[PDB]
Amino acid sequence: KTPIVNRAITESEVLAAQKAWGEALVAISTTYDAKGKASAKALAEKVIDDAYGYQFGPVLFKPTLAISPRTFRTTRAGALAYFVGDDKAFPEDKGFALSSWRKVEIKNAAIFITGNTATTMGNVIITDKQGKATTVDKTWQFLKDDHGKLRIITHHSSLPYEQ
């Protein structure tokens, strides 16, 4: 067979990358419940380095609940603080992944594969141990890096507008 490099992104990789984020989120919440804040922040570090692209510079991360002075988490620390708190630089961050998440559903409205990047926009539904679901409007942009792994370079999350 002919040797082929493939920097492009398929629809399959996009949907895997998206699922992988949910696995990562639940793993943090799960770890927090069983092993406490220490192991879970350790976990979330390997997650953010794996799933995000703070390697390349700023990530365009606007988290659902971030507040005016630190709305955009362009730093690896900004993301980790959103996910697990415990960073006096983000006083208002209690740790979004610490809410005992157990299930994540991705509901895409549209996907745009623009060469070696891909963008999804849709809903994400995260449900906890007691069944309380939360719903965000979400835009993800993945970049396929030199090693063939998708990396989050844009992450805009917002609470659905209501009346």
Added chain:
Amino acid sequence: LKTPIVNRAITESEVLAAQKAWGEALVAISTTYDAKGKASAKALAEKVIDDAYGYQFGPVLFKPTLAISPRTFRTTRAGALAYFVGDDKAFPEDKGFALSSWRKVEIKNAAIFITGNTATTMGNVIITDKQGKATTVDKTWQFLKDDHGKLRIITHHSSLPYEQ
């Protein structure tokens, strides 16, 4: 003499001009309404959405600030037009966002990412009306440089900044 060169990549200069042009279009739609009525404003918005968005390519990932849950995502040109100027019983909740007598637009980017052929910005946009009332949104834009060298919006996530 100069080497002939085709350049499909986007430059920072191109991105910033594109954000600027959007704001200029927004105020043009609002200003045409106040000065010429719904018809002339709706007509301008059609040319605007056709010029600055990429619906030609397929869906645009447009999630507007104040769209409601059955029609959160405006993947259709008619969804984008309806959000801006209302007047479409297919989108009954749409009063016409661009009709609020807007007069100034301010782009404060927090980060820019040029993926080569595309470019994403994320930051704040601050629009202010005839009487000086300012609205701030958190916005993510994605611009594609088309075969003709024009940047088009293929992604547009707007949201009210979270509070309390």
Added chain:
Amino acid sequence: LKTPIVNRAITESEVLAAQKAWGEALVAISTTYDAKGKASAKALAEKVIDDAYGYQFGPVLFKPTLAISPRTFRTTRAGALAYFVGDDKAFPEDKGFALSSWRKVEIKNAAIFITGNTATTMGNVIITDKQGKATTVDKTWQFLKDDHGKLRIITHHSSLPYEQ
């Protein structure tokens, strides 16, 4: 139902179809000459170069097998047309490469590289004429997927394989 999806990336399937279509065009130009004359063949090549090359975007990086040093690089549609069908005193050395009664085309890729929106192939192409004489070239192609989803040749380096 299916998620609406815009796909600007090139797939291996798309690349191979594109190489195949070029060979099919080549034999169509040669076969139209033998069966209809220069005029009909030149007319076909115009549609061919317009369909399969990307001169619309600017220069195409076309270096043909047997072009000579003042006009080595055919960056112009007229250069590409002249190389294929001659008949252009602007390119006096051009007898019309596609007029040699070609009948079969074989693509043997050595490597394929999909850069996302574009794709490059490098390998051999073996074209054979009405009487069974085969010519082998070392070819590099670059295909761009245009806003309409059609792969276009923006790079085309052909060369005689080196000997002794």
Added chain:
Amino acid sequence: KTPIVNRAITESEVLAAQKAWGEALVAISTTYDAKGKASAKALAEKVIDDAYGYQFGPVLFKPTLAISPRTFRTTRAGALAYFVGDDKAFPEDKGFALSSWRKVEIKNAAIFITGNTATTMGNVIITDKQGKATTVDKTWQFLKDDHGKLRIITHHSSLPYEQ
């Protein structure tokens, strides 16, 4: 100022990358003349790893003088053998950089910047210590890697056709 990642390629980087290849070629030829085959093959290794993209898989390298059975050097070894010989797997390769090169001129006919890759086509003129110039028709494709460095992923070189 606003933080910005820039995977794109500029015209300036293309022309720098091209010059850098020539520097690399002359460095090998120069080293060979003063320090022999050992230091120069060592040099050419760091060059091919630096300038080429055999990291990502096959490079589309068709060298000027490669012969029918091994026309395409899709392997790091294939390139090194073209440049400095000394590899029983490429018997016919005497080492193209071993010819005491001193000057390299790049004469571009066209450049195509297709996002985060760029393609040049033109002439290259390489002249040796005695002034004997050699002229190739050359196509280069550069990929800007996760670290911002251009890498050769396509390299088609051919002797100009004559009568």
